[PDB]
């Protein structure tokens, strides 16, 4: 009454193919990483965002000048 087999299973699994893994650059979250390095990286990223805003303002002013 309790049958077990793997007979048709590989054939089923290959109809819609074995999908490849997601590339390394997507879904690259850092949650659960070693805490001190994470804390430092956050501060660096905040400074970088401030710099990006300043650079855009300078570009806008330069274009308005010429």
């Amino acid at each position: 009454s309790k049958n077990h087999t793997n007979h048709n299973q590989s054939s089923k699994n290959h109809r819609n193919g074995i999908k490849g893994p997601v590339p390394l650059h997507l879904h690259n979250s850092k949650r659960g990483s070693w805490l001190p390095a994470l804390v430092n990286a956050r501060r660096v990223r905040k400074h970088n965002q401030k710099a990006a805003l300043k650079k855009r303002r300078e570009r806008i002013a330069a274009f308005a000048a010429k």
């Binding site: 699994n13 819609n16 193919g17 074995i18 999908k19 893994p21 390394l24 659960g32 990483s33 070693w34």
Partner: protein, 152 residues
């Protein structure tokens, strides 16, 4: 069916080679591992802390996290119709630096050297020739290939 534990059926997998027992060495201790490196996961049976499951014993992956004594590695695992990216945590005794990209790095270096020489104007090395071309063969020894009475 009756017994399925964490280390079941690892009698020959988690064993040391003949006349090669012992513990890791200072070369293993002094190896530097960075995030983004390719590593091989090979279980060291004499440590027993932070050992991976037997499924991961021969796989290669990418480091995503370094701790004071541990490494986090990403390893592909097919399940039914897809490939999952599993994150395993191990001690540094159980990993090695992978040489899976040596040929590619060498190819880039040789390309850079060739570019430097071509811009310098230095003479280039002579390119290799094919081994499948024709030619005249001058023989030293000729024999007779035969099946003889004494052969049997």
């Amino acid at each position: 069916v009756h017994s399925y534990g964490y280390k079941s059926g690892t009698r020959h997998l988690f064993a040391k080679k003949f006349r090669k027992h012992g513990v890791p060495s200072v070369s293993t201790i002094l190896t530097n591992i960075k995030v983004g490196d390719y590593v091989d996961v090979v279980a060291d049976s004499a440590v027993r802390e932070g050992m991976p499951h037997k499924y991961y014993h021969g796989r290669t992956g990418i480091v995503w996290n370094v701790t004071p004594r541990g490494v986090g590695v990403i390893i592909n695992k097919p399940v039914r119709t897809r490939t999952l990216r599993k994150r395993i945590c191990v001690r540094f005794e159980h990993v090695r630096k992978s040489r899976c990209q040596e040929a590619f790095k060498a190819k880039e270096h040789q390309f850079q050297a060739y570019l430097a020489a071509k811009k310098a104007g230095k003479a280039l090395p002579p390119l290799q020739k094919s081994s499948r071309l024709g030619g005249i063969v001058r023989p030293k020894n000729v024999e007779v290939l035969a099946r003889r009475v004494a052969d049997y």
